[PDB]
Amino acid sequence: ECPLSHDGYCLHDGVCMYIEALDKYACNCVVGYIGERCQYRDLKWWE
Amino acid sequence: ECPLSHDGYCLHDGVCMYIEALDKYACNCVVGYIGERCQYRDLKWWE
Amino acid sequence: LEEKKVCQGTSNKLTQLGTFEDHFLSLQRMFNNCEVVLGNLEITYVQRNYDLSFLKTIQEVAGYVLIALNTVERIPLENLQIIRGNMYYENSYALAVLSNYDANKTGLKELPMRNLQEILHGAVRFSNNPALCNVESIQWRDIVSSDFLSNMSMDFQNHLGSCQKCDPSCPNGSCWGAGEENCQKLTKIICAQQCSGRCRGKSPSDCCHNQCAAGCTGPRESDCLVCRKFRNEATCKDTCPPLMLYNPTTYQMDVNPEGKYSFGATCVKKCPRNYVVTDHGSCVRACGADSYEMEEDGVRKCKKCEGPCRKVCNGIGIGEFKDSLSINATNIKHFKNCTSISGDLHILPVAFRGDSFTHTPPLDPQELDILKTVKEITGFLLIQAWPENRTDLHAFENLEIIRGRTKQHGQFSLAVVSLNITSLGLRSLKEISDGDVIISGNKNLCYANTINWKKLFGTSGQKTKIISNRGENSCKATGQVCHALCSPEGCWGPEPRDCVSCRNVSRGRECVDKCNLLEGEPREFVENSECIQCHPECLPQAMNITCTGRGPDNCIQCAHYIDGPHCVKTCPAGVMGENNTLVWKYADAGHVCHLCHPNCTYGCTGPGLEGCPT
Amino acid sequence: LEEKKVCQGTSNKLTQLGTFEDHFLSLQRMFNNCEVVLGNLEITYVQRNYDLSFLKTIQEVAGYVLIALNTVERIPLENLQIIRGNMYYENSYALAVLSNYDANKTGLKELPMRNLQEILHGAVRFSNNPALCNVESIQWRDIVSSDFLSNMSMDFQNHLGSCQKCDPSCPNGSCWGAGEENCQKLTKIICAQQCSGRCRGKSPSDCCHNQCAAGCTGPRESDCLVCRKFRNEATCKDTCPPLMLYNPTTYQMDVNPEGKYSFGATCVKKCPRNYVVTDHGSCVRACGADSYEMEEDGVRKCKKCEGPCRKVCNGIGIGEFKDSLSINATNIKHFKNCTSISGDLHILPVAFRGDSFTHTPPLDPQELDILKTVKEITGFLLIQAWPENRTDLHAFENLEIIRGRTKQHGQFSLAVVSLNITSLGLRSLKEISDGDVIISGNKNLCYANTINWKKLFGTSGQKTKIISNRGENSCKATGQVCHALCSPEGCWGPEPRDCVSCRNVSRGRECVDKCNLLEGEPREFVENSECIQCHPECLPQAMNITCTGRGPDNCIQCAHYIDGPHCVKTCPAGVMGENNTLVWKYADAGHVCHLCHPNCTYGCTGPGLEGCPT
């Protein structure tokens, strides 16, 4: 898990994983939310 | 000469000459006037 | 047919939209039957034994390409031709392939990107994927552009030898895969010195037009494979053929019958019915620095700024809004008096919450009354958060129209998702023109399934998505049905204050059963279902109508006197005229106003001197 | 001389300018030392022993090239390179040689036109040169435009053969008359199969640019010899680089850092002052009828005219006015309400005398007053006849400005020669932007040397030529000098109406010494040395000034009733007003008016209701 520096980075209840290869951080958006940090709600498929 | 058809075809006191080769009609502009029918007046060299 | 099947492409740099199984469904729901990716292409977190077979019809990508962090074995991009790298991944690369291996040193093996010919803008990056084979010997000087030879870093750790070696029937052992077909076909560094770029061979007549981007068939322009600039539906030009051409003999402009509007990387015969046409016929999003708009016979030209032309307001993202992703509590002040937001509006639940990432403090809910003067939104409207205590969208009173220049996900302009609100709060919305509406997720929201959007949608083909919004059953029972008098087509609210148009007609801000034609105290007329009073000088007609307009010019009979076309109360007696000469008139038989004698100074009660006595 | 010395080129095509020695001297000074003919190149009627060695510098022509009826030896046109043929001789040809001989057949021997390499338009013709050699073995399919090959009319019988054959060192012995360098040098029928246009060798690697019009030194656009279209002091472009590019990534016109304006055929940075700029970036002479030239501080383009549109009026020489040469008594009615003239105006004695050849009756000598409404001339004004009765230009007294777009002779923009008029009559000339002016050959005409034309000239470089007018002392010692009640300079005649500037007050137009400040019934007041009349309703102050401006509140002591900022002959007595109420005043001894008691509609005369009946 990413350190105590990127808290609140992942909107809409997504976890913050640390990519060990590229040395980067990235979200894991729950179903429905797309975007770099899970902001939007997939409108074409759900509501 | 020119026949009884081009009377006044040559303005500004211009004699009408006949070119029998080309079967074309042309003026002999008195000195000072230019143009196909001697209508203009050469300003760039005189009044 | 002359158009392809486009798709929008991802934008999630390196996220994971769920688990490995419900991520793949996001890949195949959007990249299925693609022909040209309008955005980007990102293949990430595709696990072993997963079937990638829809990647066969992808012929062109308008952004970058990211093939990183997956453990599939074969990705068949066997039709990718050109990467017109508009956007850059890592701001330097237009095609990146990194870490395609799981823990036990295995992963991606093949990559049949044989048809990849040119990468207009950007670079290529290969690092740390010790399972990809045969793509190490590919000479890259042929595909990338000229200058982009110091920023296309690359390295290949292919030492396993577990792949069949290259076929010795290819140009210097440059093969993308295995077989005679999968071999790099150079078309940039093999042909004659006097070639202008792409060249399907070596003969001095093989050089291609400098407007083909990935090789050609013949030296013409209409034979390009993919082109670097506009497309006049048969050829591939550099700039669209202008509407009017000069004339070096008469110093005039001559109409060009081959007139095409430069509509965003393709020439078209006519701008869309919702775009602002530039002076020299080029569809643009919105003319900027100093101009207006002009709805003349549909063609929304924009003429010029003169005087106090108010400032226009740019939507989220564009301009200085690249960092923030919504109207957070550090930029809502810049919307102090924006009255036409040329762009888009994002209301994200991060606004009212406040994040320690972008250091933006929480937004005060009453700050949203600033938007009470936003008369126009040209792009799209994504409504995704709204304070609980509020009963409806209070800010956006009428909006009057949303045009839809840009859209959300390329399909939607209006978005009302997951709102606890009770009412709409949008009481005119008269001419929504482009895009669909997603109004769903609001658990308590009645009077939505009565608005006839076909009366509002300008473009033909748009549809509604009104589902699962406090189902119409029992909305009448709980009293939430709108006002029972106004003609039912509208009623965004439960009051008669806001209904589609009106019961029958209207007296300003109120609806009525009928105008005051024939009878009534004030005489009126009807236009657009509105009741306007006749000029006081029209005579009360107890028989037929009274007037056909506001001005005294449309009266059927004047009450007092009649000064020509107009109906006057008293004929003029001191009105300024020409040459500083005053004006005096008189009423004759039919109460008609005729002028005095030029002499009569204090006026006259009759024609000439025989009218103005001593 | 970086810029090519241009000449005008004749347009006679069948005329004799005096005698033979006169025709040749006029042709001499006209074409002496000029390197581009912007017109035509008539070389007719030269004779033996003359010298045409001054034709050794003609390099381009912009129209037909006539060579006819001149019995002479070689015509050393050894440097012509292109005949753009913008106008055809006999509607067909662009290089027409006809009947170059006498009644003894010793005519045009040779014509070393070797350097000619392309005729951009029109056919050719070479009839009837009995002694003409080696202009029969040249390729009229290499030079002539590949379209007009059906109009060619070569026919020649050198049955007096006396010319040798020249050095066999060039294609098919295609020799332009003698020698070895005097023979053809072709660049179209040796190019490779895949060459765009002309070339310089035979290899497929040496085709010329697509914009060169006659050969090229190198393979680059900056190496053409004669630009086929717009030039840039550089690479011969095809259309000047536009001002704004499109940038289809973000749909908005981004400007170009190299945009230039199309001035006929050139790419200049800025349009000249007297030329209408356009939004497209093209200096023009006029624009569509759905517009008018709105001045914009010397960048005066033309925007769309809303509703009614200004009456632009096409001058003589343009449009339907083509077969006409002056203001016939058939096209005078077409200048009725033309406040401006797009084009130019010709007045010649043929109009007053009547042309039987054109079948137009003489002009009514008083009909010229129709032209009074004319206010602006775009081209030039040429007057060569005015009726002897009138003594001034009684029809152009309202003319304001002469632009100078299409100027006569490539020269003088105002020409008034061979007149009989004492006073000129142009009281309203204020500026002649570009051109020149000659007023000469007027026996009884004066006041033309007093005006300071240096001020009326817009640009710098213009100059006047005023001679042969009535002498200085024939005017000085006869009384007909500049008026004393006028400026020390700038006068157009005796009458007070017209003498430009004034040294004292002026009743709008007329320079006078003292206006009505202390006496006189209509009094005035001076502002910036232009005294203007004021209300009679004020009181005549026999001591000091009797008004302080124009409005009603500018009476020193208004003799009538004063209502605040307004004093009128009689204060309002029941005038309908704003807010749907009535203004009712009354009269008293102190001569002040106040609002009446609203009780009686008929208007009060005092306090309350006791005056007016109720």
Author numbering:
A (entry chain D), B (entry chain C): 5 to 51
C (entry chain B), D (entry chain A): 1 to 614
From the study:
To test this hypothesis, we examined an oncogenic variant of EGFR seen frequently in cancer patients, in which a leucine residue in the activation loop of the intracellular kinase domain is substituted by arginine (L834R; this is residue 858 when the signal sequence is included). The activation loop is a key allosteric control element at the active site of the kinase domain, and the L834R mutation promotes the formation of the catalytically active asymmetric dimer of the kinase domains, leading to hyper-activation of EGFR. We carried out cryo-EM analysis of full-length EGFR(L834R) bound to EGF, using the same procedures as for wild-type EGFR. The two structures representing the tips-juxtaposed and the tips-separated conformations of the EGFR(L834R):EGF complex were determined at resolution of 3.3 Å and 3.4 Å, respectively. When the angle between the heads is at its minimal value (~10o), the flexible leg swings maximally toward the ligand-binding head, increasing the distance between the membrane-proximal tips of the extracellular module by nearly 15 Å (the ‘separated’ conformation). Although the oncogenic L834R mutation involves a residue that is located in the intracellular kinase domain, this mutation markedly stabilizes the flexible leg in the tips-separated conformation of the extracellular module on the other side of the membrane, compared to wild-type EGFR. The cryo-EM density for the flexible leg is much better resolved in the EGFR(L834R):EGF complex than for wild-type EGFR, with secondary structural features clearly visible. Thus, activation of the intracellular kinase domains by oncogenic mutation preferentially stabilizes the flexible leg in the tips-separated conformation of the extracellular module, providing direct evidence for conformational coupling between the extracellular and intracellular modules of EGFR. Our cryo-EM analysis of the oncogenic EGFR variant (L834R) show that the stabilization of the flexible Domain IV leg in the separated conformation is correlated with the presence of an oncogenic mutation that results in increased levels of kinase activity.
